[PDB]
Structures are given as C-alpha cells and as structure tokens.
Amino acid sequence: TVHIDLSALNPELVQAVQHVVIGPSSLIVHFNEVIGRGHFGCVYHGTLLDNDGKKIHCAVKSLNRITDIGEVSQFLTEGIIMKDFSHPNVLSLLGICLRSEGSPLVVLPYMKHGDLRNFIRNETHNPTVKDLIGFGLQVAKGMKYLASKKFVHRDLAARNCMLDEKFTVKVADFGLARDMYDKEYYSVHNKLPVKWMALESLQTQKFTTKSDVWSFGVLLWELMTRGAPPYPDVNTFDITVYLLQGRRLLQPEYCPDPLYEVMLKCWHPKAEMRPSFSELVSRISAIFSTFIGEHHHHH
Numbered sequence: 001t002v003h004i005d006l007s008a009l010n011p012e013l014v015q016a017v018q019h020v021v022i023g024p025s026s027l028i029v030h031f032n033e034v035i036g037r038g039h040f041g042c043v044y045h046g047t048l049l050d051n052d053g054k055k056i057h058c059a060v061k062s063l064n065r066i067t068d069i070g071e072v073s074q075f076l077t078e079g080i081i082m083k084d085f086s087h088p089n090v091l092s093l094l095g096i097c098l099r100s101e102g103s104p105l106v107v108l109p110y111m112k113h114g115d116l117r118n119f120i121r122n123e124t125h126n127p128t129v130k131d132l133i134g135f136g137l138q139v140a141k142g143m144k145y146l147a148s149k150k151f152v153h154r155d156l157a158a159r160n161c162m163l164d165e166k167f168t169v170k171v172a173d174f175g176l177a178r179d180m181y182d183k184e185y186y187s188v189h190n191k192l193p194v195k196w197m198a199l200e201s202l203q204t205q206k207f208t209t210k211s212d213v214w215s216f217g218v219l220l221w222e223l224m225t226r227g228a229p230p231y232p233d234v235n236t237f238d239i240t241v242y243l244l245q246g247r248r249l250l251q252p253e254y255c256p257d258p259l260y261e262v263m264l265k266c267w268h269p270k271a272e273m274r275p276s277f278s279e280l281v282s283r284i285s286a287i288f289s290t291f292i293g294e295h296h297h298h299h
C-alpha cells in the first residue's frame with residue numbers, strides 16, 4: 001500500500017531506474033510462489049512479457065514491509081548496480097518495475113537449479129570433486145570480471161550464487177555490493193556475514209577486492225565440504241580473536257592438496273599477499289584441467 005516519493009531519492013538513481021523500467025502491465029508477480037530471500041525482502045517466481053511478446057520466466061525481488069526512503073534507495077541500488085553486468089558468471093538485470101503504488105520490483109532471470117549451497121547439499125545431485133572445482137572456477141571468473149569493473153561484493157558465499165539450466169554458476173545477489181570508483185575500497189557509513197569476512201574488514205569495516213578474495217576462499221571451502229557451515233564450533237562474536245590467533249578452516253576431506261593451498265592463500269592476514277582473482281582463475285583452471293576424475297557439467 002506504500003506510495004514512494006521519487007523526489008526524495010537521488011536524481012541520478014531515479015534516472016538510472018527510469019532507463020531499466022519494466023511496464024507494470026508486462027509483469028505478473030507470482031506472489032503466492034516464494035523462491036528465495038535477499039537482504040531487503042523475498043524473491044518470487046514471475047512472468048515477464050517481452051518486446052517481441054514472448055513470456056519470460058523470471059525471479060522478482062520485492063521490499064518486505066517498507067518504512068523509510070533509505071531502504072528504498074538501497075534496494076533500487078541493488079538492481080541498478082547490476083545494470084551493465086555482461087558476463088556468463090554474473091547474473092544480469094532484466095529491469096525494474098515501479099508501479100503507482102507498492103514496493104519497486106527488481107526483475108532478474110530465473111535460474112533453473114536455484115542456489116549453489118542448496119544444490120551441492122542435495123544428496124541426490126551429488127556433484128563430484130571435479131564438478132565442485134569447476135563451480136569454484138566459474139565463481140572465480142565472475143569475481144575477476146566484477147573486480148575489473150571496480151565493484152566490491154562484500155557478501156560472496158555459495159548461497160549468493162545460482163545455477164542455470166546449463167549448470168552455469170552465476171554470482172547472483174548484490175545486496176551489499178558497492179562501487180569503489182577510483183578509491184580501491186568501500187568503508188561502511190550507514191547484519192554482516194561475519195564468518196565470510198576478511199579479518200581486516202571485521203576490524204576496520206573497510207572492504208576491498210582483497211577482502212572479497214578472503215570470502216572467495218570460504219566459498220571454495222563451502223564447495224569442497226558440499227555446503228557445510230564454516231567454523232560451526234566458533235561463535236560469530238569470537239571469530240576476530242580466532243582469526244587473529246592464525247587459526248583457519250581445515251582441509252575438507254576430499255579436497256585436493258593444491259586446492260587447499262589456494263584456500264590458505266586467500267586467508268593470508270596481509271591483504272596484499274592474497275592472490276588476485278586473475279591469479280585465482282589461472283591456478284584453479286590448472287587444478288581443474290589436471291584433476292582426472294568423474295565430471296558431468298561444462299566449466
């Protein structure tokens with residue numbers, strides 16, 4: 001029932017939204033069919049009528065019970081930040097629907113297989129070790145692209161990646177993503193994923209591509225453990241001390257030794273000493289191509 005006053009938003013943000021607008025008549029939000037949850041609300045199945053009149057299956061993000069303009073602005077930015085994304089391992093934006101009343105709607109392509117964490121946890125799907133390394137390589141390529149556009153993700157985790165009908169892994173949620181401009185960092189001004197955060201980010205609240213590399217390492221560990229929760233016997237509040245003591249996530253059972261070395265490199269206490277995403281793509285690609293095991297998907 002909300003009425004959003006657009007004159008209360010930053011003009012550059014409103015113009016950006018206007019450019020990716022979806023006509024209210026072209027979208028059916030299947031509001032009785034929940035499919036996920038972002039940082040600002042739930043995600044639903046949707047049907048999008050395209051420019052050529054074809055029905056497109058989509059995922060629609062909405063704001064859950066809106067109270068203030070700041071929340072609307074952050075939610076719209078989580079859609080606008082994705083507008084120029086064009087990479088096979090990065091989810092694209094289909095558009096934004098803003099009706100006369102109610103929450104704005106961020107429209108994304110539907111990803112057949114759902115989130116990466118749930119996919120690997122499914123005992124029947126049972127991805128092989130090589131399949132898991134391949135998923136890790138795909139995420140690395142998406143992050144290499146994001147890093148090249150000077151965006152800091154800040155919330156990289158398996159649950160934030162999706163798999164499409166061809167098993168292509170795409171970095172999908174950008175609810176905490178920020179443009180670094182020419183600064184090479186983002187510091188918090190205005191619910192943080194503690195067990196995926198770099199030690200320096202937990203201490204200073206400053207995020208960089210190198211802090212995303214740390215999160216990537218944890219995502220690789222989630223892959224190799226088939227979606228186990230990290231540090232299960234460490235409380236969220238005791239993580240900083242645990243990490244300052246030099247302690248790290250242990251080698252997963254079926255994980256190749258060179259891939260565990262890659263994870264360790266991602267968690268170096270000195271951010272400058274961590275590999276770049278370009279270096280991670282090269283290293284993981286060599287591990288992937290030399291691991292001769294059973295494999296299903298195309299990486």
Ligand SMILES: O=C(CCc1ccc2ccc3ncc(-c4cnn(C5CCNCC5)c4)cc3c(=O)c2c1)NCc1ccccn1
Binds near residue numbers: 113159162173
């Ligand atoms: O929700 C999130 C992050 C937010 C986010 C970001 C982008 C997307 C984009 C598309 C999408 N496509 C397909 C399916 C889907 C859902 N199910 N299926 C099929 C249905 C038939 N069975 C096989 C799966 C396809 C779900 C989604 C989403 O909900 C989604 C959600 N992470 C997940 C998360 C969120 C919170 C806690 C844990 N995990």
